[PDB]
Amino acid sequence: KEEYIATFKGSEYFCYDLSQNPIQSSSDEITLSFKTLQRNGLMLHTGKSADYVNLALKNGAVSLVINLGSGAFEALVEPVNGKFNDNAWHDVKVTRNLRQVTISVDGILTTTGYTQEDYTMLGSDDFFYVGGSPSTADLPGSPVSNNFMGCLKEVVYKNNDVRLELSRLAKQGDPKMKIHGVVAFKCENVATLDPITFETPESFISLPKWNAKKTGSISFDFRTTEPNGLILFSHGKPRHQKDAKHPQMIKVDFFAIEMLDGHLYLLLDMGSGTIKIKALQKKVNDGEWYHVDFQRDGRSGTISVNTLRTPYTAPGESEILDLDDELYLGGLPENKAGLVFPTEVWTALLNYGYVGCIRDLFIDGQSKDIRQMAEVQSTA
């Protein structure tokens, strides 16, 4: 066993079914560690009506609410000097024995209080949500509407009878555990969860050149409601002759991801022909998030959207994507010297620029803070 982690991006949650083995306890413990930059997000919740537990971040404080039917306990713990949404790990330990609740943060202090009136037992037969839920704001005792945005690890709920290793069950899988959204079982950078909006077709960023010619990967999440747009594009040095006078004569190693008429396509040329692939059958301009993953070794690889994956093999005997200079996200520059427009990229031929959100971009498995890039590079 190593530590079990996940990343939550605002629409991600775990759900554990409690119907077959519900909770009737007089003693409880909840432990986990969180890392975040958002002031508000549900960490976990478990009751549906009279009895409930809700642990959340509210205005940078850790907020715990526990009601056993006769009335609630509620408490917020926060440093005198600042907040807990500081992109640092924090451990939270929560214990409950009959009516007495205790919460310790970062093994620093312990706060102890009580639930009201007479009831002594926590009952929940519904769901155990981690990181979010379908409607967080309707959860009883919830002080937040937002789902978690950051990393959670080592989420564990135990009592005298049951121990639910909820992070573990998430990764490894269980008939009673269902997980939803764009979940990676890893924590890289919390800063990168913040989306970037391309508000007009003309807006775009220029990222760094791709690390190697022979292999590469690129992955990212996108959300969009427009039918056409150039999401990603890069090309090499031109291979046609100087006395070439027709755009069909253009020869250049290029890579592109584009949307046309609602459908998402990958386009790639390695020196010997252009291959073009409808990355998924359905239209993806419905405003929902999609995860995009592209893997390439030589002239073969894969392009995944969500969990549909598609293999591809490029023509030719060259195994090298000989990319040059810049890689463009969200559109193209107006006055770039030596910019080449392949004939197959209809998006670039018609100047369709992307409009939508991109989030959490990865090149060669290394996370990239595009926000730093956006602020630092012309906001367009």
- Return the domain boundaries, the chain: 1-186, 187-380
Class of domain 1-186 (CATH, top level): mainly beta
Q: How far, rounded to the nearest angstrom, does the alpha carbon of residue 337 sit from its chain's CA centroid?
A: 35
**HEC secondary structure over 78-96:** CCCCCCCCCCCCEEEEEEE
State the Cα–Cα distance between residues 22 and 46, nearest whole angstrom.
Answer: 11
Q: What gap in Å lies between CA 52 and CA 42, rounded to an integer? A: 14
* Composition of the chain by helix, strand, coil, percent to 5: 5, 45, 50
Tokens in use for 79? 């440093």
Neighbour-count burial of 151, counting CB atoms closer than 10 A to its CB (0-12 exposed, 13-18 middle, 19+ buried): buried
Residue closest to 300 by CA, chosen among 324, 323, 329, 277: 277
* CA contacts within 13 A on the Cβ side of 119: 17
Q: Is 68 annotated as a binding residue?
A: yes
Question: Residue 39 burial by CB count (10 A; 0-12/13-18/19+): exposed, middle or buried?
Answer: middle
Which residues in 56-82 are b (16+ Cβ under 10 Å) and which e?
bbbebbbbbbbbbbeeebebbbbeeee
Spell out the CATH class of 187-380.
mainly beta
Residue 266 contacts residue 277 (beta carbons within 8 Å): yes
What is the experimental method? X-ray
Burial zone of 255 (CB within 10 Å; 0-12 exposed, 13-18 middle, 19+ buried): buried
332 in a known ligand binding site: no
297 assigned to a ligand binding site: no
> 355-377 burial, b for 16+ CB within 10 Å, e for fewer?
bbbbbbbbbeeeebbbeebbeee
